[PDB]
Design an enzyme around this catalytic site. Structure first.
Site, PDB file in Angstrom:
ATOM      1  N   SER A  48       0.736  -1.139  -0.131  1.00 10.60           N
ATOM      2  CA  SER A  48      -0.288   0.143  -0.287  1.00 10.60           C
ATOM      3  C   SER A  48       1.437   1.189  -0.311  1.00 10.60           C
ATOM      4  O   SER A  48       1.824   1.484   0.425  1.00 10.60           O
ATOM      5  CB  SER A  48      -0.821   0.219   1.400  1.00 10.60           C
ATOM      6  OG  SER A  48      -0.157   0.844   2.499  1.00 10.60           O
ATOM      7  N   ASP A 153      -2.037  -9.181  14.256  1.00  8.13           N
ATOM      8  CA  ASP A 153      -1.220  -8.118  13.623  1.00  8.13           C
ATOM      9  C   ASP A 153      -0.820  -6.890  14.030  1.00  8.13           C
ATOM     10  O   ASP A 153      -0.133  -5.698  14.090  1.00  8.13           O
ATOM     11  CB  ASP A 153      -0.605  -7.617  12.123  1.00  8.13           C
ATOM     12  CG  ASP A 153       0.205  -7.031  11.514  1.00  8.13           C
ATOM     13  OD1 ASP A 153       1.994  -7.323  12.140  1.00  8.13           O
ATOM     14  OD2 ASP A 153       0.525  -6.541  10.480  1.00  8.13           O
TER      15      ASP A 153
HETATM   16  N1  LIG Z   1      -5.328   7.254   9.923  1.00  4.53           N
HETATM   17  C1  LIG Z   1      -4.483   6.829   9.514  1.00  4.53           C
HETATM   18  N2  LIG Z   1      -3.890   8.580  10.217  1.00  4.53           N
HETATM   19  C2  LIG Z   1      -2.587   8.599   9.656  1.00  4.53           C
HETATM   20  N3  LIG Z   1      -1.701   7.310   9.327  1.00  4.53           N
HETATM   21  C3  LIG Z   1      -2.171   6.447   8.996  1.00  4.53           C
HETATM   22  C4  LIG Z   1      -3.209   6.639   9.362  1.00  4.53           C
HETATM   23  N4  LIG Z   1      -3.151   4.347   8.609  1.00  4.53           N
HETATM   24  C5  LIG Z   1      -2.436   4.159   7.838  1.00  4.53           C
HETATM   25  N5  LIG Z   1      -1.649   5.884   8.121  1.00  4.53           N
HETATM   26  C6  LIG Z   1       0.398   5.109   8.189  1.00  4.53           C
HETATM   27  O1  LIG Z   1      -0.186   4.502   6.495  1.00  4.53           O
HETATM   28  C7  LIG Z   1       1.532   3.951   7.708  1.00  4.53           C
HETATM   29  C8  LIG Z   1       1.183   2.322   6.803  1.00  4.53           C
HETATM   30  O2  LIG Z   1      -0.670   2.156   6.984  1.00  4.53           O
HETATM   31  P1  LIG Z   1      -1.050   0.632   6.958  1.00  4.53           P
HETATM   32  O3  LIG Z   1      -3.187   0.212   7.818  1.00  4.53           O
HETATM   33  O4  LIG Z   1      -0.630  -0.563   8.677  1.00  4.53           O
HETATM   34  O5  LIG Z   1      -0.876  -0.328   5.656  1.00  4.53           O
HETATM   35  P2  LIG Z   1       0.295  -1.511   5.452  1.00  4.53           P
HETATM   36  O6  LIG Z   1      -0.147  -3.073   5.956  1.00  4.53           O
HETATM   37  O7  LIG Z   1       0.342  -0.964   4.020  1.00  4.53           O
HETATM   38  O8  LIG Z   1       1.425  -0.789   6.129  1.00  4.53           O
HETATM   39  C9  LIG Z   1       1.451   3.372   8.957  1.00  4.53           C
HETATM   40  O9  LIG Z   1       2.533   3.525   9.594  1.00  4.53           O
HETATM   41  C10 LIG Z   1       0.783   5.344   9.549  1.00  4.53           C
HETATM   42  O10 LIG Z   1       1.756   6.151   9.328  1.00  4.53           O
END
Ligand SMILES: Nc1ncnc2c1ncn2[C@@H]1O[C@H](COP(=O)(O)OP(=O)(O)O)[C@@H](O)[C@H]1O
Ligand SMILES: Nc1ncnc2c1ncn2[C@@H]1O[C@H](COP(=O)(O)OP(=O)(O)O)[C@@H](O)[C@H]1O
Ligand SMILES: NCc1ccc(-c2ccccc2F)c(Cl)c1
Ligand SMILES: [Cl-]
Ligand SMILES: [Mg+2]
Ligand SMILES: [Mg+2]
Lengths: 323, 324
Positions: A48, A153
């Site tokens: 992502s 996770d």
């Molecule tokens: N609601 C949110 N607000 C701010 N930053 C976010 C949010 N959701 C995700 N992020 C940012 O995006 C990064 C990756 O998102 P995530 O959903 O964990 O996907 P992935 O599985 O591809 O790592 C997080 O580590 C964070 O820094």
């Protein structure tokens, strides 16, 4: 291997209609991404690209997670779980599901969280703060577990904290799965450091308790100022790091209780280890975050036997949370 | 039209932070409905299905209000107000907010009230019980008004009375709104019979005093045994029913004072009516509930001019409550 089942919320999905848990049949309605203007890149994950964005219809800040189309089953599973948990305590809110007209790339739209840096939080977090945020995570886990979902996770990077507003959100539901008693699951889930002994020994009939192990790893890292707490260099080494703290005695008792067949690659690396005392990890730099309450609580989370770990609801009643 | 503001609790929300009254930004945490087992249907409202339920974690009786999803803004407004008033005197207690895992239908969980039948209560209430329950309602209204909230749907069906335990709760906060001085509100609120003259003449800058008019309608219906007291067949006819009691002369003084423009649909139906003496509603069947103090109190609630009505705190000091 010996069968096992969760001690809490065992049959919550068995007592629900197929539409709640059957994500392969769930109909996803993909809106138009033109309603969102991308502002800046926030992060980049495994499959992502995460952006800060503005909803141009109400001038509201949102987060757009653009997904690299890996199995469509996986995307559908993440959407269904996010829709089932939408509104739950400390669960990230899925606001929209959109597709870009020209690229046709899937994108999930979430509420915006102003995340405080892990390193910045590490230095400024007090004993009270650890108890406060640990309780907030337990609310999210007891809720998703009550909803028949295992996050799978749990780790500090999947926990968004806006320290100024004392706002916490459990994010990244891409590995989350519906708990069905007696089901055999894929053990290649969670991040290395947070993987439960059940995954490392290839014991597939695991449950919500996996999340309680990962939470124990987070607590040990925060109170002892050692991140990660169990620092494996690979998945086999990960079990060795755990064994060096909880001993090979309780480990063999665990494999014998569930009739687990250990991989031969574990023979020349596992060795023999005594069970350590949680007190040895106390030092001058972490003594202000450690308490007999915190050590007793950790001891009840970091157990080889997944059935012997505190449930999220039991964990909430622990004397460590008198705040 | 001439501006107007409340004579009490005028600026209570202006001096509070946005967190208190900005319901659109309020974060609602929806619990799991599995902790509740539905028992039976208790009532069905305009956009809700109300059930008696059991909390299976403590074996306690609760009420679950299943919401027919209208604008999510309205649900958020009702939750925020219920959370702001939680614990207040004679205010229904919001115990939980939940969603059914499968349906994802919003539901509100309240403390259970063992409600006595309106018809059964109407037959057994004494002069004393009316003064008592009238006082309990005034505590709930003075409190929500002090908290910068207008209920806007005061009527006997929104008042739960457990007569055995002399327990009273003001319910149904779905039309309730934050009072902001000088704000123009929607006049399509309250139930027909309980609508204040300000709503019927389309005067949008109303306040807490709307609740005092609706309370006056409830008092007149109980002491005179005539339910509803002002029996309109529509919203225009509703003003005619009021004018037949209060007279057309004070009605024209009210619209002149606030420079209100009467709708042309009122010309062929309003007519001319003298102000009636409250003593004209006394009969053999209701004289045991009527007294000079009750009539003086009613007269001070049922006034066209919303500013001239007693406030809930003034109403509590009236000689009608000497007994309580
Ligand atoms: N609601 C949110 N607000 C701010 N930053 C976010 C949010 N959701 C995700 N992020 C940012 O995006 C990064 C990756 O998102 P995530 O959903 O964990 O996907 P992935 O599985 O591809 O790592 C997080 O580590 C964070 O820094
Ligand atoms: N706490 C309660 N205890 C008992 N009955 C209640 C309670 N709350 C609501 N009810 C019943 O449910 C009915 C409808 O509830 P209400 O809150 O007025 O919803 P609506 O706005 O849709 O009309 C009431 O008229 C009453 O009979
Ligand atoms: N639940 C029906 C109901 C029945 C009667 C009353 C009442 C009691 C005393 C004074 C005035 C009243 F209108 C109420 Cl509030 C509600
Ligand atoms: Cl004024
Ligand atoms: Mg009602
Ligand atoms: Mg209600």
């Amino acid at each position: 291997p010996v069968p096992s089942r969760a001690r809490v919320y065992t049959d919550v999905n068995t007592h629900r209609p197929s539409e709640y848990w059957d994500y392969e049949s769930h109909v996803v309605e993909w809106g138009n991404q033109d309603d969102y203007q991308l502002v800046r890149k926030l992060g980049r994950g495994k499959y992502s690209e995460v952006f800060e964005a503005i909803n141009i219809t109400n001038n509201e800040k949102v987060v757009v997670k653009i997904l690299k189309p890996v199995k469509k089953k996986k995307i559908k599973r993440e959407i269904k779980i996010l829709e089932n948990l939408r509104g739950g305590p400390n669960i990230i809110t899925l606001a929209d599901i959109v597709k870009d007209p020209v690229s046709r790339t899937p994108a999930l739209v979430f509420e915006h969280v102003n995340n405080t840096d892990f390193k910045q939080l590490y230095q400024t977090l007090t004993d009270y703060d650890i108890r406060f945020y640990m309780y907030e995570i337990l609310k999210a886990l007891d809720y998703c577990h009550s909803m028949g979902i295992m996050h799978r996770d749990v780790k500090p990077h999947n926990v968004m904290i806006d320290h100024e507003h004392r706002k916490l959100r459990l994010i990244d539901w891409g590995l989350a799965e519906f708990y069905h008693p007696g089901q055999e699951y894929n053990v290649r889930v969670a991040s290395r450091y947070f993987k439960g002994p059940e995954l490392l020994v290839d014991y597939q009939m695991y449950d919500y308790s996996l999340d309680m192990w990962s939470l124990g790893c987070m607590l040990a890292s925060m109170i002892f100022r050692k991140e990660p707490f169990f620092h494996g260099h690979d998945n086999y080494d990960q079990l060795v790091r755990i064994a060096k703290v909880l001993g090979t005695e309780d480990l063999y008792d665990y494999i014998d209780k569930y009739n687990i067949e250990l991989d031969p690659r574990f023979n020349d690396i596992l060795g023999r280890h005594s069970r350590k005392r949680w007190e040895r990890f106390v030092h001058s730099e972490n003594q202000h975050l450690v308490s007999p309450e915190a050590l007793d609580f950790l001891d009840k989370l970091l157990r080889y036997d997944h059935q012997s770990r505190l449930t999220a609801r039991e964990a909430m009643e622990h004397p460590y949370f008198y705040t």
